[PDB]
Ligand binder design. Structure first.
Ligand SMILES: Cc1cc2nc3c(=O)[nH]c(=O)nc-3n(C[C@H](O)[C@H](O)[C@H](O)COP(=O)(O)OP(=O)(O)OC[C@H]3O[C@@H](n4cnc5c(N)ncnc54)[C@H](O)[C@@H]3O)c2cc1C
Ligand SMILES: Cc1cc2nc3c(=O)[nH]c(=O)nc-3n(C[C@H](O)[C@H](O)[C@H](O)COP(=O)(O)OP(=O)(O)OC[C@H]3O[C@@H](n4cnc5c(N)ncnc54)[C@H](O)[C@@H]3O)c2cc1C
Lengths: 284, 284
């Protein structure tokens, strides 16, 4: 069904966990993200600029962070947040599973490193989107191509196969893929989304797919799509010294706020966002 | 004599150490402060909001920070910084011992918690000051009272006893005091600095001292006195998202920049300041 919380934290990396441990000062808090917290932490080899942990390996620091949240009774809700609608005094939070409401939101999604595909921006809203399940009814009986950058994208492909006339899945990571037989896996490199007034084809290095929709599925939609009305410049969510965005009650912390992309900056921002959000909840 | 460095960090607490470990990316760096890093860290009992160190004691976290800087060959220069003069393209740094020049400065002095004495602001520049050794020639053959909040203040009293006709030392901490016999220790509580056009007396709870100067000696002068021309509001050094102050080449990080006074905020700010300072050194 629906569940209400005082604070929702969108991301489970350094920034979101820093927010969570500072918000547990009560005030219900929910943290959305991945079971493994942050993929970048796991991939980091030796870390020498996180003060107090000289020479730690990324996966070791990840475990220290996991034990911290576990000691404080903080769990990660393992769902993808698709859209956050600023209703004015609260936020409606749409996810890959259930819908939530929260009084305050802390954006902590990190920063996407991969570039958009050619034609992606051009056809946005004319056949390109960032949430396949959200737009699924629009593609009933149509051809849909999903360019998947994470495992959740596979679930969206499976769902779309129940409505679309044909589903192609283009993986952008190496794994076994848990897809129903109706999904055609296209192990090729996307080149360009093309069309006249709307999407007509996805061109790949060795193949072209006639398709009505192309969904580009990453850990998070671009922030201005995830949070309609949010002020972003240069792909960075713009915040002030209190980590406040342009949307009252919506904060942002970590790589999603701009450079430098470092752990200490991220945890500091998460702390500031959470303490300010809590203050606003007690002052109304 | 004088020594030149690319970056000078003013403070050895969480913020300054975070700056130091991020600036050692070369670029000579000098860190001014106390041997014990930060007094607040030592006094902190259990810390649960420093991500990755759940349940750590303050002195334990202090030791982790000490081992980090030691592993990176970062030493603390154990002197008090008295004044930083923005010369335009560099900074002249006056200390309780030698003078330094630095291309970039990172202010990391923390935030003073004790309030000013009554009359302190009123007589500033008319008998009240924050550096006794700096103003010592002005008090040759005059009466000087030092209200000392740290051990360095004792050294300043000893120096002033060579020039002033009479030196009183009013300690604001419990310890043995290493003072020459010419210094009179006044174990009483300051109440008010009084005078007409200039300082004439220090009133204490049980005694009044006729005095020509009153020096209030804390770990650092107020930031607008430490750094002439620095923009401060509400006792907080005002910085932007890059930790830049109003003075080009001068950054600030940690409690000295405003609330919340927390460790994660401080280390994040120190990191941002240092990485920006380094960038400016490589771009000129
Ligand atoms: C190989 C490598 C080495 C690095 N080494 C260092 C180093 O030595 N020192 C250093 O300071 N920095 C280092 N970094 C950078 C550092 O990892 C980042 O600055 C830091 O991880 C930022 O954390 P964050 O919480 O802002 O974002 P992230 O760490 O990206 O966390 C984001 C998390 O939120 C989840 N999420 C995002 N959007 C949504 C959504 N819509 N719904 C649900 N969940 C979502 C993601 O799945 C992810 O788990 C390194 C990065 C890499 C890639
Ligand atoms: C009892 C107590 C418990 C606390 N518990 C927590 C907690 O659980 N979690 C949390 O997040 N925060 C806590 N805090 C607050 C936290 O300690 C501060 O936010 C943090 O120490 C800020 O560090 P900083 O580097 O900005 O300043 P500081 O820690 O004050 O470091 C300043 C250092 O620079 C030196 N210095 C200053 N001026 C000069 C100068 N002119 N020349 C030379 N050296 C100078 C000082 O001697 C000092 O050593 C606590 C504070 C106290 C007092």
């Amino acid at each position: 069904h629906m569940e209400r919380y005082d604070i929702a934290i969108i991301g489970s990396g350094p920034a979101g966990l820093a927010s969570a441990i500072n918000a547990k000062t009560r005030k219900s808090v929910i943290v959305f993200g991945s079971s493994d917290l942050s993929k970048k932490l796991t991939l980091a080899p030796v870390i020498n600029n996180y003060l107090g942990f000289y020479g730690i390996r990324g996966a070791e620091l990840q475990e220290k962070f996991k034990e911290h949240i576990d000691n404080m009774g903080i769990q990660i809700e393992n769902v993808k947040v698709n859209n956050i609608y600023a209703m004015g005094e609260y936020f409606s939070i749409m996810t890959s599973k259930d819908t939530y409401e929260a009084s305050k939101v802390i954006l902590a999604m990190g920063m996407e490193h991969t570039k958009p595909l050619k034609g992606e921006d051009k056809f946005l809203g004319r056949g390109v989107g960032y949430c396949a399940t959200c737009d699924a009814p629009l593609y009933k009986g149509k051809i849909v191509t999903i360019v998947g950058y994470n495992k959740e994208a596979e679930s969206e492909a499976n769902y779309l196969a129940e409505l679309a006339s044909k589903v192609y899945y283009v993986p952008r990571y190496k794994d076994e893929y848990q897809l129903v037989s109706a999904v055609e896996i296209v192990k090729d490199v996307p080149v360009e989304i093309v069309g006249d007034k709307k999407v007509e084809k996805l061109k790949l290095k060795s193949r072209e797919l006639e398709t009505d929709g192309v969904f580009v599925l990453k850990d998070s939609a671009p922030p201005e799509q995830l949070v309609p009305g949010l002020y972003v410049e240069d792909g960075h969510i713009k915040v002030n010294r209190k980590m406040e965005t342009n949307i009252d009650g919506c904060y942002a912390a970590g790589d999603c706020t701009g450079k430098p992309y470092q752990y200490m900056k991220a945890v500091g921002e998460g702390q500031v966002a959470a303490l300010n959000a809590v203050e606003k909840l007690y002052t109304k």
